[PDB]
């Protein structure tokens, strides 16, 4: 009865584990032993954006490497400019508690959502120029953790009721639902082709879904605590996740197994946000001990540190052209970092 | 070029002017988080101040006392695991923790919930306003004597009524000893690790009580005064 099914489940997991080890010839570090070090990386806070009264929980760069939208728990959703610091909008939220934010690829719509199970969506370019809520996508049970605008008419929202859903804006209903993880889904990131996406949960496992088909394809289990954030490699064949054990792990899609674990013995805090560089060589990770670490994807080296924040860093985002890095935090300040020749 | 840029700055000046206005109202009100179990009279506490009216997610109740506004949040539809959304309430003025005193069964579960809240890294600086609710039913349970608190808390035989006890005139000694034991059980957790960053404010409350917003007011006022004194290093 019950024992018959569980016996197959244990054996089936054994088959996967043995299969993964079969296709593991050498580690990524072993191959990249001859790759020359990246070198010390120094970053200067080019701009500092102020105007949020409480902690910042979300931020998202625009498609034009401009107008980062950030959400804070004072009931504000400000759209900045990142040049001349001018604020473009100060959209007020119905619920003061917001845990995520989004910017549509077309730049016309901006989503929201938080401890209200509702993914409010705003139309920036209204006829009269006044921003008003266009849709209130309800149907999730738990809170909302992340929502990425997959095309201007659809949006994938990851909720705290162990589900991710794909909405249709005009209909306002769940087109498909991905009943996966056994814990809260804390983060989400769509593939560059906008076909697949991944999601890190509170069960220390990040799955991979097919948006069109609607069912999980692969499950990755290398962590040992809740996954707080997750990104994608720019080519779309790898991704990196950060969890509560202060480890960032670079998983691989085709190899279906983890490759490197970026960590240090002096770090025990726990990652809150990750993001790759434009070419994928760098991996920035927003840590809990008030500063971010600029790792090195091909070999764990910790090239640099962006130590400029007072409270914990709960945000990260690299522009489309990879020119700047914005790190919001719980001190209500967004710092736009950049390189220096 | 500057002709169009002035329009952008003019909008940014208008946005800042409204943000400054909203900064005053945001800092004027006190945000409170309400916590408790199924048996705790959380709804009855809310219904007491629900009179002052102005998938669901989180509820909010706005009540104002002595021209001071309070916001009182209660999570409506969230899963059992609350280790991830509890970090949103790291800036609230105080946490209103409601406990059903007359249960004797989930009391240990209530104690563990208080312990995790007290020791949480992001709630290390949030004072907890303890509301030992349903004190009226505790009198009935103790007076009847059918259920003995000793059966669940072994360290009750050696407990003696504290000297600083202030029972209501006409309250039985057995009830006073039993009700203060529960209070001292929670304060043992609070004083174990809370030095000066945050305190506990126990309150014996009945199912219905016309003075509960004042208790929150008279105790949120103490929290504000203590924080300002600690900012000046006078405390």
């Amino acid at each position, epitope marked *: 009865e019950l024992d018959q099914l569980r016996q197959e489940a244990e054996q089936l*997991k054994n088959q996967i584990r043995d299969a993964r080890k079969a296709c593991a010839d050498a580690t990524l570090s072993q191959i990249t032993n001859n790759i020359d070090p990246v070198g010390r990386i120094q970053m200067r806070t080019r701009r500092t954006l102020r105007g949020h009264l409480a902690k910042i929980y979300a931020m998202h760069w625009g498609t034009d490497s401009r107008l980062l939208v950030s959400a804070s728990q004072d009931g504000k959703l400000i759209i900045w400019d990142s040049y001349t610091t001018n604020k473009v909008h100060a959209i007020p939220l119905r619920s003061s508690w917001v845990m995520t934010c989004a910017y549509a690829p077309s730049g016309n719509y901006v989503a929201c959502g938080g401890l209200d199970n509702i993914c409010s969506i705003y139309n920036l370019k209204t006829r009269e120029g006044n921003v008003r809520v266009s849709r209130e996508l309800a149907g999730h049970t738990g809170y909302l953790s992340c929502c990425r605008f997959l095309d201007d008419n659809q949006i994938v929202t990851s909720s705290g009721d162990t589900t991710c859903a794909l909405w249709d804006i005009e209909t306002g209903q769940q087109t498909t639902t991905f009943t996966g993880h*056994t*814990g809260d889904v804390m983060s989400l990131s769509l593939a560059p082709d906008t076909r697949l996406f991944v999601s890190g949960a*509170c*069960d*220390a496992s990040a799955k991979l879904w097919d948006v069109r088909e609607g069912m999980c394809r692969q499950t990755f*289990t290398g962590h*040992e*605590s*809740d996954i707080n954030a997750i990104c994608f490699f720019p080519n779309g064949n790898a991704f990196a996740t950060g969890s*509560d*054990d202060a480890t960032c792990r670079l998983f691989d899609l085709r190899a279906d197994q983890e490759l490197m674990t970026y960590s240090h013995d002096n770090i*025990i805090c*726990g990652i809150t946000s990750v993001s790759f560089s434009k070419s994928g060589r760098l991996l920035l990770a927003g840590y809990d001990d008030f500063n971010c670490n600029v790792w090195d994807a091909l070999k764990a080296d910790r090239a640099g540190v962006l130590a400029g924040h007072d409270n914990r860093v709960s945000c990260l985002g690299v522009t489309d052209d990879g020119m700047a890095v914005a790190t919001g935090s719980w001190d209500s300040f967004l710092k736009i970092w950049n390189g220096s020749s | 070029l500057s002709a169009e840029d002035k329009a952008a700055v003019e909008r940014s000046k208008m946005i800042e002017k409204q943000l400054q206005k909203d900064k005053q109202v945001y800092r004027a009100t006190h945000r409170l988080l309400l916590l408790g179990a199924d048996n705790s009279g959380k709804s009855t506490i809310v219904k007491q101040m629900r009179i002052y009216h102005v998938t669901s997610g989180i509820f909010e109740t706005k009540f104002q006392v002595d021209k001071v506004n309070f916001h009182m949040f209660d999570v409506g539809a969230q*899963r*059992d*695991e*609350r*280790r991830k959304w*509890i970090q949103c309430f790291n800036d609230v003025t105080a946490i209103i923790f409601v406990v059903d005193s007359s249960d004797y069964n989930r009391l*240990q*579960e209530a104690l*563990n919930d208080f312990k*995790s809240i007290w*020791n*949480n*890294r992001w709630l290390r600086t949030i004072s907890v306003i303890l509301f030992l609710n349903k004190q009226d039913l505790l009198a009935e349970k103790v007076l009847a004597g059918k259920s003995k608190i000793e*059966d*669940y*808390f*072994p360290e009750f035989a050696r407990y003696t009524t504290p000297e600083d006890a202030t029972p209501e005139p006409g309250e039985d000694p057995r009830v006073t000893r039993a009700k203060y034991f529960i209070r001292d059980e929670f304060l043992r957790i609070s004083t174990a690790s809370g030095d000066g960053r945050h305190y506990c404010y126990p309150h014996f409350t009945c199912s219905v009580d016309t003075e509960n917003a004042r208790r929150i007011f008279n105790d949120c006022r103490d929290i504000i005064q203590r924080m300002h004194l600690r900012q000046y290093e006078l405390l």
Partner: nanobody, 128 residues
Framework: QVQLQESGGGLVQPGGSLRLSCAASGFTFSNYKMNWVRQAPGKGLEWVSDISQSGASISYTGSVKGRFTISRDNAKNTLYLQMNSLKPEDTAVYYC?????????????????????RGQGTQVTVSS
């Protein structure tokens, strides 16, 4: 893969003794405050005992104080809890569950109806 399968359990006469061992793999069995939640039939998950990162900080629930002991072996990667003087209402399914995060003292969701880092469960029955 955080797995916390448990051993021991079964049928024991009232007033006897029993020992449960929970072996943890897939994570560093250290810097993790462990627990020993249990669930009686017809009742919700309840918390029995817990141990600190390296011992030296141990607490029990009221009903089992003085009858159970809890020990851990970081090198052996096992968590132990030894019963003594079993009573008829102690019949329950015991789980070993670790705190959500390392280097912490605020284990939050250990008795929740669902929890990722809990064991399968060992059945303990006290009857004749």
């Amino acid at each position: 893969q955080v797995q916390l399968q448990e051993s021991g359990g079964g049928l024991v006469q009232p007033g006897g003794s029993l020992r449960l061992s929970c072996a943890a793999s897939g994570f560093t069995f250290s810097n993790y405050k462990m627990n020993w939640v249990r669930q009686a039939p017809g009742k919700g998950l309840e918390w029995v005992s817990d141990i600190s990162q390296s011992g030296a900080s141990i607490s029990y629930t009221g009903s089992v104080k003085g009858r159970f002991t809890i020990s851990r072996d970081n090198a052996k990667n096992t968590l132990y809890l030894q019963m003594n003087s079993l009573k008829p209402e102690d019949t329950a399914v015991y789980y070993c569950a670790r705190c959500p995060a390392p280097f912490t003292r605020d284990c939050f969701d250990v008795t929740s109806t669902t929890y990722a880092y809990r064991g399968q469960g060992t059945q303990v029955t006290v009857s004749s």
